[PDB]
Design a protein around this ligand. Sequence first.
Ligand SMILES: *[C@@](O)(c1nc2ccccc2s1)[C@H](CCCNC(=N)N)NC(=O)[C@@H]1CCCN1C(=O)[C@H](N)Cc1ccccc1
Ligand code: NA
Ligand code: NA
Lengths: 10, 25, 251
Amino acid sequence: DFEEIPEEYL
Amino acid sequence: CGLRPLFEKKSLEDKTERELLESYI
Amino acid sequence: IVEGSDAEIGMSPWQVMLFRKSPQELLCGASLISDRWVLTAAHCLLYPPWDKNFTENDLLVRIGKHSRTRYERNIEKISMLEKIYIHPRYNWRENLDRDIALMKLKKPVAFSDYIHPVCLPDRETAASLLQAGYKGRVTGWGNLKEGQPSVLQVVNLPIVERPVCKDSTRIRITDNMFCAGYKPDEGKRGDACEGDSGGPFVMKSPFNNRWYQMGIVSWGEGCDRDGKYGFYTHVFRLKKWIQKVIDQFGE
Ligand SMILES: *[C@@](O)(c1nc2ccccc2s1)[C@H](CCCNC(=N)N)NC(=O)[C@@H]1CCCN1C(=O)[C@H](N)Cc1ccccc1
Ligand code: NA
Ligand code: NA
């Protein structure tokens, strides 16, 4: 239920 | 280190830090 | 945390979130000790009975967080690890003795109202504060009960005397560990709980009024049981080790 993070991060 | 911007820095105290300090006999 | 409360904003700006890229999910707590160094529990990275063995590439470090779940768009800073360092004598096979690790950030983080490091105790600071009766504070986004909170939780707990610690369990307790919580008589509750691991046990010095990290959430049996206590990595006893890697590898 974790909101999505910026792909710049992964 | 250990001096919080929103608290120590402006000389404000958090809601329960005194419970800490009062335990230090 | 069990029986704690929501943290106020900026109350624990050294609080870090250990974050799994995939499945993206909360691994453990951690603490910021400088702009490039994070302190955690070695069992958050390496724990063979459960098949845990994380590498740098597997993780993200989230700093300046309040919400468990949201990406805090102009508040939190996410970082990549350059390197992981675990206590060579960490004991995962029996009691989690020396449960500590250091993480070197790829790039230094900029401090802010929400992001600021905690101090590491000194012999004399440890000496006056690490006392039975003295209270410390624990923080984390872990289990609420032996489910997950929406916001960072905090709890104040008293340090307990070694013998009581020792008599509460069958696991072998070492000098690299201390236990905290209220006695059942005492009638006040609170504990850390699964998911809180690797988070800071801090005390505020009455001498220079800075916040010092005395312990790291380590292990317990159940959460908030009467006659039982949380166990923490005694940070001061392991200081030299720490001194050693920062001094041989970064800053
Ligand atoms: C902490 O939140 C975690 N670490 C891991 C790492 C990977 C997966 C999931 C999590 S949970 C947790 C903190 C417990 C605090 N409890 C109280 N204060 N009441 N730690 C653990 O669960 C550790 C890690 C392995 C086993 N743990 C235990 O606490 C066992 N219940 C007891 C134990 C102690 C020593 C050796 C083996 C077992
Ligand atoms: Na015992
Ligand atoms: Na207990």
